[PDB]
Design a protein around this nucleic acid. Structure first.
Ligand SMILES: [Zn+2]
Ligand SMILES: [Zn+2]
Ligand SMILES: [Zn+2]
Length: 92
DNA sequence: ATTCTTGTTTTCATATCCTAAAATTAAAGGGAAAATAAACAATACATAACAAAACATATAAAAACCACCTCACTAGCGCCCCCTGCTGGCCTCTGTGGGCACTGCAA
């Protein structure tokens, strides 16, 4: 098992992607064989993956969405994604 | 005158006594061979005395037998680690389970 320890332990039958964890195999499988049994309580949307889209539910319906400012350096403009702040800060 | 009894001496007679010669017979004397007895001497048997041998008692002299002591062996039970292996938690290092943020792709 030291061969399999901290490696791509679980192969996928349909495609050659591999993940270390089983949970990843169940989520990966649902994309190939569409089950999407997770459903926002306020809209029609049916989600494949777990509570990240339950976070969809939360935010799409909660007026307390509160987008984290995440202010940069001197210019100070706000962006919703970390990679954007790092790239624009490198030359700001 | 004649006849008849009775008493007393005489004398034969017949048994007895005495006497002496024979014969004889038993005593008695002597010669001699047995012969019992007796005096003395020798042998054998029995009794008594002396000396020695045999028997019985005491004593002690090795000596044998029995009982006690003692110096070991034989059992005995702890005693004390000691070593070795399993066992039952214990804990921490990998490793089993999972939530979730993150990204690359292609709309
Ligand atoms: Zn697959
Ligand atoms: Zn919703
Ligand atoms: Zn800036």
């Amino acid at each position: 098992q030291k061969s399999h320890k901290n490696e791509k332990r679980f192969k996928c039958d349909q495609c050659d992607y591999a993940c270390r964890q089983e949970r990843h195999m169940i989520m990966h499988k649902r994309t190939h064989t569409g089950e999407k049994p997770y459903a926002c309580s306020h809209c029609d949307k049916t989600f494949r993956q777990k509570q990240l889209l339950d976070m969809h539910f939360k935010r799409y319906h909660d007026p307390n969405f509160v987008p984290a400012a995440f202010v940069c350096s001197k210019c100070g403009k706000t962006f919703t994604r970390r990679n954007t702040m790092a790239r624009h800060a490198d030359n700001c």
